[PDB]
Every structure is written in structure tokens, then in C-alpha cells.
């Protein structure tokens, strides 16, 4: 069965970096929990019951549909949130590993440009979804955006970084200011070691 | 040009019925404002500049696209929010006109059953969107749900009631509790006279 992973830090460890305890309580303890629970209930007694999250996401994604299945919606969001918690971390001025810095410069011209493009994608996803830094099928880095729970697994890409732009992710702390949220996220919240580890 | 309509009540007139002043300030004065402003900017100097909101919504909708154009996203949301404010109103125990009540009983079995079905549709729109009561082109009353800004105009239906289930619409007052929000909306917020007037 799907299980809700523990956060790798205390619920208040991101507060001084602009993501409140309250946000982490609702987002992790309630929203992510619901993806786990709803996922489990929909998967029970199906062909997907044995399988890994990744297999279920890839297997249930319908490229030709506006809305995805309940199984997909929950499995995809379970995976997304599991990555998201690990992609953030406490600590001022978290180190960006050399290998990642180099790869960002190579693909975007500069880290600054990468951050602008990432933030623009997040601002540009109309409604609920995610902005991503991915490694594409040619091994190049690029920015994508997706709706709802859709994610890079759906496209044979490797996620390096994801930012939740569903309003629940930021509304408590930023209200309607999704751009300020994205900027802050990139400046203060990202665990670049975790990002680098996915390359 | 698009213009932001005034609310038909004071910003705090819904507070005792479960939609806070703060929600109306953010949702009306910032979110709806942005659809108006961004819509105007995107439409300026296009073939759509002359046209009514309704014509723009119907003309720019791309049947089957997951993501619609910027023009559509803003025009559709402008129309949606304009209906939404008029569909709510102050006053404890607002009354339902007979013609509407009869139509609902005929189509759903009871008003209670209608409300359950409406709430279920709103809960079931994964991500951002709207739940609706519509009169379709056959004259039948029925419940629909749509993503993001998509609405009944896109399907040749007449909207009787719409409820915003984008998280901004309820997160301040209900956090993650979208079902409690929907129940409260139907029990306390809906101006049934405005609903009836659309039939
Ligand atoms: Ca720094
Ligand atoms: Fe989320
Ligand atoms: Fe809204």
C-alpha cells in the first residue's frame, strides 16, 4: 500500500525560510495523506495493487484525456509530494553542488536564468499543477510545467526539482502571490544536494 | 474592455454565513481584478477586442485541449466570477422560488438530492475548477463540473448556479475542507432568486 512518508525535518523547520508550520501541517498531514488514502482505496482489488507508485503513474496516465482517473490523480500526487518534501530543507544558503551548478549553466546560460525560467513556468501553469526541472531524453536539462498531478514520469523524463503550484502549497503564506512564493522557494527552500542527487 | 463588476453586497456581508471579508477582498479585489486586467492586456489589438465576454469564451475555447489560451483562461474566469458574486447574497434562510424548486424536484427527486449531487461534483473536480447546475440545450437540468476557467458556455449550456472550487475560493475560511465549503455554500450563501432568474 501507499504510505505517507515522514517529512525529513520538523514541521516548523521551514518557517524562518518562508514556509510556515501551518502550511506543512495542512499540506503534509492532510493533503498528502488524502492522496495516500484515496489512492489506496481506489487501487484495492485492482491490477495495480501489487505495484510501485512509478509503475501505477506510468500505467494509468491517459495522454489523450483532459481529466485523468482517480487512481492516476492520487498516485501521481503521492509521488509528487514525496519528492517535494525531500527537495526542500532547513538551513540558510544551502550549498549548490558543483555538478548541478555546471549543468545549469550549460543548459540555461546561468543559474539566475534557470531560476527565472523555472519561476515563469510555475506562474504560467493556469490552475493547479507543478513546475519542474527535468533531464530530458537527450540528457539536456529543461523546464516543464504540468497540470494537477501530471509529472515527468508521464513523459519518460527524470525530475530534478519540482515546485507545487496548487494554491494550497502557498495560499497560507503568500495568498495570491504565486510569483513571490516561487522566488522565495528557489532562493531559500530548495535542497540543492537533493536536486543534484537525482542527476 | 472588461470591467471588474462591484460585488452586489458589502465585502463583509457574507461573513456570518461562512465566507469572510478577507476571502471577498482577495478573491474579488485581486483574483477577479487580475482576470479583468490580464484579459484586457491579452485581448488588446486582437480580433477579440470588439467582442462580448461570452463571444470571446465561446470563440477561444479549444475543445479537447488540456491547457487553453491565455485569452480563454482570463475571459472565461472573468465571466465565471461575474456570475458567482451575483449567485450569492446576504440573509439567513434565503427562500427558493417555486418554479426552480419544482424543476429541481423533477430533475433530482428533491432539493436535498440536488445539493448532494452538486457538492459531489465540486469535490470531484481534481485540481482547480467549478461545479455547476445547468440547463442544457434540451432543457434538462443537470450537474456539471469543469476545469480551471472552462464553463457551461463552452458546451452550449445555460449556467443556473456555479461554485468556484479553486482553492483560493475557500482556503482562507475552510483550508482543505472543500466538502464543508460546498455544503455551507449551498445551505447559506446561494441566492436562489438569482439562480431562478437564469432559467
Ligand atoms: Ca542565499
Ligand atoms: Fe500539494
Ligand atoms: Fe476564483
UniProtKB/Swiss-Prot annotation, chains A, B:
Q: Where does Fe cation bind?
A: 27, 81, 164, 168
GO MF terms held by the record: metal ion binding; superoxide dismutase activity
The protein's required cofactor(s) are namely: Fe cation
Q: Does the keyword NAD apply?
A: no
Q: How is the cofactor bound?
A: Binds 1 Fe cation per subunit.
Q: Which residues form a coiled coil?
A: none
Enzyme class name: oxidoreductase
- Return the EC number: 1.15.1.1
Q: Could you tell me the keywords of this UniProt record?
A: Iron, Metal-binding, Oxidoreductase
Function in brief? Destroys superoxide anion radicals which are normally produced within the cells and which are toxic to biological systems.
* Record's subunit section: Homodimer.
The entry sums up its family as follows: Belongs to the iron/manganese superoxide dismutase family.
The protein here is known as Superoxide dismutase [Fe]
Protein source organism: Rhodobacter capsulatus
| Gene name for this UniProt entry | sodB
Amino acid at each position: 500500500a501507499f504510505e505517507l512518508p515522514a517529512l525529513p525535518y520538523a514541521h516548523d523547520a521551514l518557517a524562518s525560510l518562508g514556509m510556515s508550520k501551518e502550511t506543512l501541517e495542512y499540506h503534509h498531514d492532510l493533503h498528502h495523506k488524502a492522496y495516500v488514502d484515496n489512492g489506496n482505496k481506489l487501487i484495492a482489488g485492482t491490477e495495480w495493487e501489487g505495484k510501485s507508485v512509478e509503475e501505477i503513474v506510468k500505467g494509468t496516465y491517459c495522454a489523450g484525456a483532459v481529466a485523468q482517473s482517480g487512481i492516476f490523480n492520487n498516485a501521481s500526487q503521492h509521488w509528487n509530494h514525496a519528492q517535494f518534501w525531500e527537495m526542500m530543507g532547513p538551513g540558510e544558503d544551502k550549498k549548490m553542488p558543483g555538478a548541478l551548478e555546471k549543468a545549469l549553466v550549460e543548459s540555461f546560460g546561468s543559474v539566475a536564468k534557470f531560476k527565472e525560467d523555472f519561476a515563469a513556468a510555475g506562474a504560467g501553469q493556469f490552475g493547479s499543477g507543478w513546475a519542474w526541472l527535468v533531464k530530458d531524453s537527450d540528457g539536456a536539462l529543461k523546464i516543464t510545467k504540468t497540470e494537477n498531478g501530471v509529472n515527468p514520469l508521464c513523459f519518460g523524463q527524470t525530475a530534478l526539482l519540482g515546485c507545487d503550484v496548487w494554491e494550497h502549497s502557498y495560499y497560507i503564506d503568500f495568498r495570491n502571490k504565486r510569483p513571490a512564493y516561487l522566488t522565495n522557494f528557489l532562493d531559500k527552500l530548495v535542497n540543492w544536494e537533493n536536486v543534484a542527487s537525482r542527476m
